[PDB]
Amino acid sequence: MYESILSIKPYNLSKEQITWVNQTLVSLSDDEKLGQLICEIIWLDVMKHFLPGAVMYRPFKAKRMREFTQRLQKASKIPLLIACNLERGGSGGNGGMEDGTYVASPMGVAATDDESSAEHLGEVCASEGSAVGVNWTYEPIIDIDMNPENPITNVRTYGSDPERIIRMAKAYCRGCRKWGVLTTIKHFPGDGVDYRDQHLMSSVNNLSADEWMDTYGRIYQALIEDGAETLMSAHIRQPNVTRMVNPLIKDEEIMPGSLSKELMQGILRGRFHFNGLICTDATQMVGYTCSMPRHEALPTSIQNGADMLTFTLNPTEDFKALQEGLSCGLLTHERLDEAVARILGMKAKLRLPERKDVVPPLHAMERIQSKKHKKWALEIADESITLVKDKQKGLLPLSPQKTKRIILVQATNEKPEGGYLSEARLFKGLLEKEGFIVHWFEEVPRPGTGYSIEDLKRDTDLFIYYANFKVSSNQTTIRLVWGDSSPKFVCDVPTLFLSFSNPYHLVDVPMVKTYINAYTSNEATVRMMIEKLMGRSSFKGKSPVDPFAGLWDAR
């Protein structure tokens, strides 16, 4: 059975492999099959309530991951899919591992407009992940960064141009497959139209059916045909596409991707002929929990096309809900077997059953933070940093002979110990190496009743802003927050603004005359920024997006 699925892309299993999937399927109890639908988060005692089909590692040390893998796999009757959000390399972006290589955000790669940079990104992700036993990355994101106010897309995307997104996403996958790591296209039906986070609600892709088909649909078809192994159906609604499949559907029946049969079975399975593994986005996100009673939602997600539920809330209650859903018919035994078949087929595709070692040789660990990976990080930084606005004649290149005294102003939504980002301290120290006098904004006076603008101009030749407003779950804005530290004197003291993450900061500092986007806040990007501000390195980056956000005043 299931040869029509397992023998073709993205599976392409052999006769023997399909026999293993079928024989394993037959040997599983109902509870075992239900457990296979669940991916459990590791933050490894996750088998007390059921036997899960997969796990995802939060960011611990690479060595710990390699240890967890050996233990988890050696204890699992059915080999586990081992997931990780390897987004920006081995490290970076709230996922990956703690001591991996942080290469660059996806948008920083897109700024290079060189798809070989995305392939390199995918290689570092999959090379360092597979060394510790990871075989499934929840990447690449193929959302379109349409709405500059969306807090959860932003630098996690390859920008706002569908054609570039397709180029970069395909290259990323190309790099991952070279290391035997499954890829995941997300977030279906597509984030980036709304301005709201699906962690906090069910966000809405409200494009017309045609508009969606022409943009998001085009990208998904491109990655599906490219051989995308897995897809993540997120808690985002597409009402107009849903109504196209089901014109009589009531607005209250329209479910997000993770619960919608019109989207997962009508569009993906049907119209687009996606044959890979579908998993939901994390089930504890508000976008999921607020759309339907949970005891109903978990089995309905599988019944409506999803093969896997990502994470549990209360594991006992959740498994009990799957048991009852199967018992009372919310989930059919026939759809259950078909889901497990696709889960087991990806485990067979990875050749996990035949393997008799589990983790690679310890020598594999040497790829982590290898010279080659560090070197790609420096190439991407050299190619990505983008001079967006340069309307102050003579300012660049910087030199202590033109602006000796600098006030360095940090702006971030992080809360680093000591008050300052290590990357900002490094930037400060490197400016001083060049011969600048650099004080933090907090160290020097500011205009007021006892300090004049003439005094400020006497003590300050240049303001420089280090902006790092990063993407994180459950944030409703990544806008620039302070307000006397803002560029309020751009016509009195020259002012330079540097964004090391969010590229739309001109929304909040439109008065700035010199503005540069770097997309990534890591040591490699900081070092190339210094080289470029001093005139030793040319500005090569190209905005993969509109950094002015359609604002007349930002120019």
Supply the DSSP symbol for 214: I
DSSP 533-549: HTTSS------SS-TTT
Report chain breaks in the chain, C–N > 2.5 Å, as residues after which they occur.
Answer: 43, 482
DSSP 419-478: SS-HHHHHHHHHHHHHT-EEEEGGGS--SBTTB-HHHHHHH-SEEEEEEE----TT-S--
Q: Which of 90, 98, 192 is nearest to 141 (CA)?
A: 192
Which residues make Cβ contacts (< 8 Å) with residue 194, sequence separation at least 6?
147, 150, 203, 204, 205, 206, 236
Residue 298, phi then psi, degrees to nearest 5: -60, -50
- Reduce the DSSP state of residue 313 to 3 states and report it: coil
**Identified catalytic residue from 194, 197, 281, 307:** 281
CB burial readout 84-102, b (16+ within 10 A) else e: bbbbbbbbbbebbbebbbb
DSSP bridge partners of 42: 57
Which residues make Cβ contacts (< 8 Å) with residue 23, sequence separation at least 6?
none
For the chain, give every domain's residue range.
1-385, 386-555
Residue with structure tokens 């059921």? Answer: 50
Resolution (A): 2.1
Token output for 92: 């970076």
How far, in Å, CA of 438 to CA of 62, rounded?
37
- Is the omega angle on the peptide bond into residue 187 within 30 degrees of 0, that is, cis? yes
How far, in Å, CA of 380 to CA of 123, rounded?
14
Cα 27 to chain centroid distance, Å, stands at 37
The structure's method of determination equals: X-ray
- Reduce the DSSP state of residue 187 to 3 states and report it: strand
How far, in Å, CA of 254 to CA of 331, rounded?
19
What are all long-range contacts of 453-458, with beta carbons under 8 Å and residues at least 24 apart? Answer: 453/489, 453/492, 456/489, 456/492, 456/493, 457/492, 457/493
How far, in Å, CA of 503 to CA of 154, rounded?
8
Do residues 256 and 201 make contact, with C-beta atoms less than 8 angstroms apart? Answer: no
- Reduce the DSSP state of residue 47 to 3 states and report it: coil
Residue 30 backbone zone (phi > 0: left; psi -120 to 50: alpha; other: beta): alpha
Do residues 172 and 141 make contact, with C-beta atoms less than 8 angstroms apart? Answer: no
Residue with structure tokens 């007021």? Answer: 448
Q: Letter for the amino acid at 104?
A: A
Q: Which of 383, 369, 361, 365 is nearest to 89 (CA)?
A: 369
Radius of gyration of the chain (CA): 25
How far, in Å, CA of 539 to CA of 555, rounded?
19
Active site (annotated) includes residue 459: no
- Reduce the DSSP state of residue 228 to 3 states and report it: coil
